[PDB]
Copies of this chain bind each other. A is one copy, B any other.
Amino acid sequence: TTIVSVRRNGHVVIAGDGQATLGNTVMKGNVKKVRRLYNDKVIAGFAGGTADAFTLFELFERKLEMHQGHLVKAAVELAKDWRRKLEALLAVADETASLIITGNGDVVQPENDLIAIGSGGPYAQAAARALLENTELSAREIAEKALDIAGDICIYTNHFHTIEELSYK
């Protein structure tokens, strides 16, 4: 799996592949790993088992309403509620911030709001970081291009894309 998030110029996106691997075989190639939440002003991407991550969605989407729609707090609260047999990673972003929510119940603020998680995560991070620091490409162009390179390199990442973008100020 590979989930990428890039933020640039009042835009933020999350892109994910669609590969589901069982052993050395592809079960499915069109998995939707990126969705919108909270009246479509919150975007999220997941890596891991479809169940555990879907648990996290509701569990997170709940905390969003339960906390006004405040991204950071909703995530922080959730860090306590998971602190139990789940293994998945969650990439979450809105107009204000971008974070990662992990299995142990950690909440992580990526360095430049650049998120790259999954098996193919580090490869996408390398491509994204490169494009960020040496081009004037858009957050959507960078995330998409980084995801293709990751799929080219990671055996467990493909070339099916789901991309959700968020325009703001």
A residues lining the B interface (CB < 8 Å)? 20-21, 23-31, 49-52, 54-55, 58, 76, 79-80, 82-86, 100, 102, 104-111, 119, 121-131, 133-135, 137, 145-146, 149-150, 152-156
Contact = CB atoms under 8 A, between A and B. Distances in A.
Nearest to A80: B55
Contacts of A152: 26, 29, 129
Contacts of A105: 49, 51-52, 54-55
Contacts of A25: 121-123, 125, 153-155
A160 to B, nearest CB: 10
A56 to B, nearest CB: 10
Contacts of A111: 28-30
